[PDB]
Amino acid sequence: NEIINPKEYDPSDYPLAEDESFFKQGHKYDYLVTFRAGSLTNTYEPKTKMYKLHAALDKLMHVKQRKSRFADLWRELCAVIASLDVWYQTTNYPLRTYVKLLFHKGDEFPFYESPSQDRIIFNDKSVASILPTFVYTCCQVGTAIMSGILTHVESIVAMNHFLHCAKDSYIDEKLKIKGIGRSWYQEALHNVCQATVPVWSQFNEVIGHRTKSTSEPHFVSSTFISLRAKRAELLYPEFNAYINRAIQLSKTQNDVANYYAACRAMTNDGTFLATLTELSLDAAVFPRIEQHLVTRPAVLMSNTRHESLKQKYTNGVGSIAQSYLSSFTDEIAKRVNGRHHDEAWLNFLTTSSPGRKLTEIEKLEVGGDVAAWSNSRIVMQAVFAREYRTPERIFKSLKAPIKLVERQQSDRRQRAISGLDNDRLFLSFMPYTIGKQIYELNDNAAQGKQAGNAFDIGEMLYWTSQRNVLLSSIDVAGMDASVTTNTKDIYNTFVLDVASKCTVPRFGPYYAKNMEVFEAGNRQSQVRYVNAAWQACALEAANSQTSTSYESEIFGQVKNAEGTYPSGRADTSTHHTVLLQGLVRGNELKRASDGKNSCLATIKILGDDIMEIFQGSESDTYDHAVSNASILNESGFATTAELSQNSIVLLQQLVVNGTFWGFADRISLWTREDTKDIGRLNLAMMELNALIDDLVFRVRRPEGLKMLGFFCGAICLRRFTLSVDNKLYDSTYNNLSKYMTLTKYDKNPDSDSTLMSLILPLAWLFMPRGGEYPAYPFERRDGTFTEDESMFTARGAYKRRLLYDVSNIGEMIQQNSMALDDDLLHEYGFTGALLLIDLNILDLIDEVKKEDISPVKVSELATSLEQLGKLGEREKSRRAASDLKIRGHALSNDIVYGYGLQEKIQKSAMATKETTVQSKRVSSRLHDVIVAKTRDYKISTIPADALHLHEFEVEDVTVDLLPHAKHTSYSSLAYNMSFGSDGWFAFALLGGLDRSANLLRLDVASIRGNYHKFSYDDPVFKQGYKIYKSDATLLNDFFTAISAGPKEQGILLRAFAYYSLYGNVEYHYVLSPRQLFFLSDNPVSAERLVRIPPKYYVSTQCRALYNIFSYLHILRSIANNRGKRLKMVLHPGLIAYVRG
Amino acid sequence: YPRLEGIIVQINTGYVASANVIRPVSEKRYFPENLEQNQSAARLVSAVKARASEADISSIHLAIAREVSPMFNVHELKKIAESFEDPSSIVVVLEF
Amino acid sequence: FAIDPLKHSKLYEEYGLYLRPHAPTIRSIKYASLIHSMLAEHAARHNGTLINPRMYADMITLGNTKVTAIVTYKALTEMSTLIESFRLPSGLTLIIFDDEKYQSLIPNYINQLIAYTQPHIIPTWQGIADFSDTYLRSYFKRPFELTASNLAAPQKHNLSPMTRSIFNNTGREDAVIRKLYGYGEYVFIKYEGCLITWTGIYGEVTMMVNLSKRDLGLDVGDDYLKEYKKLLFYGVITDAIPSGISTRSTIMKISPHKMMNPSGGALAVLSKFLEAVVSTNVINATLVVYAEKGAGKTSFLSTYAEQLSLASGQVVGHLSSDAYGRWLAKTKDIEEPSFAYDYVLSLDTDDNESYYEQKASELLMSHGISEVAQYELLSVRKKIKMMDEMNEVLIAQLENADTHSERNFYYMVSTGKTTPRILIVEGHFNAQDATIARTDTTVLLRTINDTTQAMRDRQRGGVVQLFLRDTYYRLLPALHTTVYPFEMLESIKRWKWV
Amino acid sequence: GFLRTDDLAIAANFPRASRNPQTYIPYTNQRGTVTNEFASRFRTIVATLANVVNERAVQDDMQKATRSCTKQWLRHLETQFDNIAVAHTDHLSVVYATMSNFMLNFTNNFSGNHATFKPDQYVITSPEGSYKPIIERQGETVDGLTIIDTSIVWPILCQCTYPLVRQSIMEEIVYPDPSTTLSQS
RNA sequence: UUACU
Ligand SMILES: [C]O[C]1[C]([O])[C]([C]OP([O])(=O)[O-]P(=O)([O-])OP(=O)([O-])O[C][C]2O[C](N3[C]=[N+]([C])C4=C3N=C([N])[N]C4=O)[C]([O])[C]2[O])O[C]1N1[C]=NC2=C1N=[C]N=C2[N]
Ligand SMILES: O=c1ccn([C@@H]2O[C@H](COP(=O)(O)OP(=O)(O)OP(=O)(O)O)[C@@H](O)[C@H]2O)c(=O)[nH]1
């Protein structure tokens, strides 16, 4: 009844203090309580603080509730509910009853969003305030019904739990359930008990299966009694009764995996938890002191001002950490020595973002063009290029307050992070470069996520497969808060003690000079010789201001009480990595110091996610597992608490028993909140294809997820709205209505542009250049249908084969023709979609933005940028890029260096807008592109394709099944890899994952910005190989177009020589390692599966090209694979084309 | 005052850096043309690039000035941890 | 030089360094100032940064790179006819001399040459700039000290007005020494502060104040309590702490010294609070001042409230730094306590005992001790375990936001409407930052006080005062901006009011 | 190298710690020559080192290409040594001569033969105390002074340009002033 | 209106 008739406003729900300075501290219901739309209203006049409160709470209910990824809010909810009709063939599924009962008012929807006026405007004022989130919850549960994670009757238990959370505060109730409702599997894995699992080898192939009995040990059975009492009262009793059946009924290790992913989607809707950030400043970034204070170092040296210069620890928590870390200061001082930092400054001051500043009065006195550029980091350094060597540059930015950026995640609460300007970014940079070189030194300073596939988990898959191990995986809780200034100092000694042994001259606005230094236990100042790294680090360490200051529309300027970690500085990933590495490894020196063993194996720290691995008896490991907790407990950290036998998590990826569990709900399909790089474009479908491939091994039914991505691809992503002008509006309508319907829109006073939106037909959802989405089986002429395209289908030039696949490829080889059926492509509408491809709207909108800005104003700005750096002979990289192109062939833009000085400026002209005068000459150029290509169209076929038209013929004799398939027969090595499914059989028939390929690719991206999926496109690596394979004697010349160092040159060359077995540059295909986790990279593994009669081997690369033909058609047609071995026949022009 | 070597080196270091005798450039020619990429030399190019280190201007001027400086603190070698296992390990002997 | 001494001559006059009247170095100092008019133009031409500073810095510093399409290399070509114009056998050289007033006044185009020069650095003793170095000694006016021993003639010590200037160290009047002793035509350096060499418990301690010898009393050999109030407002004790000056210490000698310059890195942090007090945007700005227990700041920032409120036209009030400890002892027991502002300030300083001085007092007993000389007999790790025991009664008031906790006290005092717009809290120990609320401006006060000497002073100090200074120094490192109490009195004045 | 007497210091009556002040300049001034007699010494070293790595490769039967790409690297150090020995033996050697005549560079450093040299250990003896040696391993680093980096010869040989290797740009070889290293001394 | 790895 809190949803069917909600209460009134109750203004004690968002109270204030005695003053109107901030909200009342310790207030509950910090998020948007469900109160029934009508009741908020302004009463009183535009001042008197509380008016700005009710106006901004209106911004919470009307603006911060919608975040629709592709379409509007209603088109997206219809996309599940239509797809959920088509798949289950009926309408007796009970999700639509929640669509009917939660909102139905008989004339029109209860609420819509404006887009142009940007708010959700209501049409029933009596409906609940919280309902625009319940679109996305009904969206997500139907995504989970379609995924196969939840059945229909389970989604009843889901939806009742969500509406029960909505009685008082829909997210505040959810964040308390979030901890309890997924910690329960460790009981169910205990109860299952003896469970038969695969095991892995050192080099991650499956070598065996064993039955290893999961009974978690005696001391975590004492954590079951404390936790199940909290399960009973904090949860809804039907959601509780669903859990208590999953403890008792579960019989296999596969069976707990069924309930766990399904109970996880009952606690999440994927909605990003958005309120106004004044409410979450108290919750997220307020510093907590968990119990202990951390004491200070003995300061050994101090300069003329009494501040820390050199310092050492005395019997604390830090002395444990510097027992491990201070050994590295003699080596890192030769790696932090041998970079020249001014160079590495301009490469880290890439990624254009903000400076804090709004430039100011001097935005006028730099120019009106560079006024509008003035957001990027690379531009705000260019405007103040003159000030870079003066030491008063950093002094005038201590005066500048740090502004609170907010960004939110899928399940964490609304979180804030500090957007530092260029000078507060400068002091943190030398602690970033010092703490970076511990990564190459110590494995356990660990994994960056360049693999995407199994190598990000190939560590965790191995140690869980082993015997006599307990695994702990620690999050500290909140690790921005906890880092008081004293705990921050343990990283400061390590950054100092490297910089003394090192020799860095000048660094920036410093120089190695002769300072007065107090030497503790001397009386009297004695002048040491300090280098610039030393000076910079001391100043930054001394000076540190931590507070974030957010300007409010309610309040004046709220400022966080400092002492947190301002997590944007430069070292926000190293300061929590180098610290926790010193505390846990330093423990096994201190435990070895007083007669106890260590008994700890490899530990992987990506800050803050600690994950260590132990071995021995069940008593020895626990004596160590307490001290890793207790020293982190006495470091001032709130470790939450996690450990188990056979359970381990890292980077939000669960590994258990030697199997991979998914966390499917974290990829929310239909909530973005980015306000940056929004596509309703070709690029909007790439944002679907990348997220559809995120969920292919987190799903129990990938065929159903292809059904869901199709209709949301169809219904939502269908309409591209374009503002023409009137005279051209007439013929823009007439030309495009010839092929596919274009909507027309009602005419305009006194803006002189009519809108009009084209309708982008369903074939464009399948095109090679448009939507690269895998298809359903079409009809040929007779018609015996095509193969159903599965989830493992690779993208780029392969979707152009689907055009030839409709034309009966087997038939074509019969008549010896490259000819094509224009009838069948025009009938479905394939011909009307490749026109929309050839119109090329996207770079045309980029061309007009590239047309408007004067390159003279850019060049004066960018010549001043290369004054800070190298100094000279960034010119030799521009010379190397231009010498390569005119002698040979085009090496394109983003990659080579000084163009990627110029390209880093460009993005603010890309940012700062489409607006209308530029938009009127969009339509003048596009209509010229329209009337040329509409004047006649036929499907343009290229000489560069013969090179499909090959078709496989099934035979009567079966394959072998690769003996690791018996081991992963049981139990449930991933979610979709259940026994007798498509992904299991592909891991059986296609088989394997090599270590040899994606170690070198894991070696490539350590050059070039690693922390995520890194899917194989990599415009250094493909462009360098097309020169390496066919062409290279030139390959000396474009390495200095990279400005690749001699070490960096060595990485790439070893990957080029290994990428010469497979495959072809001439036939393009792209998949992602997120798409095929355990499936093989190599087309070598598929040549075992297809014989080629060896009169077809007809060119020097032609063995290596036929492998990709064998590689893809197994992955494309895996739902129609009996386990027969197919055989290849070819068109003789395909024989004729590769001869050359 | 055994820090007196720190002065006499620093006077001699300030002479070498003021003479403009060695200027470090940003072009590396450790290997001839198209032996870098040549597969058989993959064992050799790793040994050279591990030893060779970026030419900081501050310590090339120090090594010249240490040659005629008075030695008061007894110098000692950086602990070179090599194996002399492969025949690509002659790079350490050519270094000496 | 970095700044030329003929177009900008008064800055060298502020250091005691007067320009020699108008030869191979008189001709060279005109040659260097001609480059600055060329250099400054060039970094106009393209704002600011003169382009290719490497070939620039290999011309002034090194007699090198004669150069003759073009406009790129135009400013190089115009300059190679300018430095090969005057015949030098080597370069000109730089001369930063290591001073936050001098280093801040270096123009932008000189600082871009510092990366590629190896410049000559002249180490300041305390300031003055101290006069060796064929640059500083052949260019202008090696001076002559004029203490009480070298009296009273210029013919006696063989001085000349074109080579040597005179530093008044008599204690006599300035005007007579160039009247009857014959020092007319001899120009005199002007110093407006003074340097005091005190006696100490540990040795000779040299501190300076930026007051002249007339502006305060104390000469020669008066004690430390005479005009103590002016020394706290304006002094730096340039010595490694523990310096060890005491209330029984006297003066050895006085010489006029250069007025020291405040801290461009520590002027601007304090300038945030002196902006947030002015603007009507920021509700209830807060200044947080950390120091040791014996820095003597409750007697100091009681009049800095009196200097800010008279300049701002507002009402400020400092919370007097122990008002958690005085107040929690009074109402440990009381279920609803009064969080009012007028109740807090009518409670402390001094007669109400602190709560931590109850807790510390009980604790010292348990490891039984009551004498300060008995505390010296204890040593470090046996001491430090006592400090660790002392912490656990700290964290019980810092961890949660209970109704008697520290977080609730500094909140409701700061919010509730009876309080002043802009309170100044002061904290003893670091990691009170999660409790004081809410600010962007936390400074760190280092006064002219060996604080552990003032705790054996205190004169009802005992071990309870001295154990807690030691406990708080274990919790307070210098991880914030040191603020040096004359600099807060300096920044009020600089700020531009309405 | 050779052994140059300090004729400019003794005529200037500078303090020296020897009877004959003799510093060891590392290599001879080599004007007017076509073949550089310091560069051709490094020819006969690589020609000796080519046969040492030849025996080690053929005793342990490695590739024909790995032995060729080793010896193609040994004569790439030949080419780079010829290009810079014109600038060492003309412009570095006149700096080691004039740094030897400075005031505070008073000890001898080297005397030709590695087989016999030890630095002359003076001490400050005392009949009523211990003797304090001058040269003494006490590990008192001056922040990088006692540790000696042998990887400094790779930037010297390869990635540095010299004011005589560049001849073809106009350079005007820098002769520094006497007064800075005199006034500090 | 918008941070780093
Ligand atoms: C130039 O032009 C342009 C474009 O086109 C636009 C867009 O629009 P759209 O968005 O497309 O729409 P949509 O979304 O499609 O829609 P739907 O969803 O389909 O449905 C609808 C709805 O809607 C609404 N509406 C609402 N509101 C609010 C509105 C509307 N319409 C209109 N027209 N307007 C508005 O406002 C309803 O209701 C319904 O329901 O846009 C454009 N743009 C715009 N603006 C701008 C742009 N650009 C740039 N700039 C600017 N300013
Ligand atoms: O955008 C981001 C996201 C995350 N981080 C990372 O967040 C870390 C600090 O965040 P924590 O990981 O410590 O938060 P918490 O887990 O204690 O919060 P709860 O789950 O308990 O609710 C930092 O160490 C950092 O590396 C960022 O710096 N930026």
Ligand SMILES: [Mg+2]
């Ligand atoms: Mg965490």
Ligand SMILES: [Mg+2]
């Ligand atoms: Mg985390």
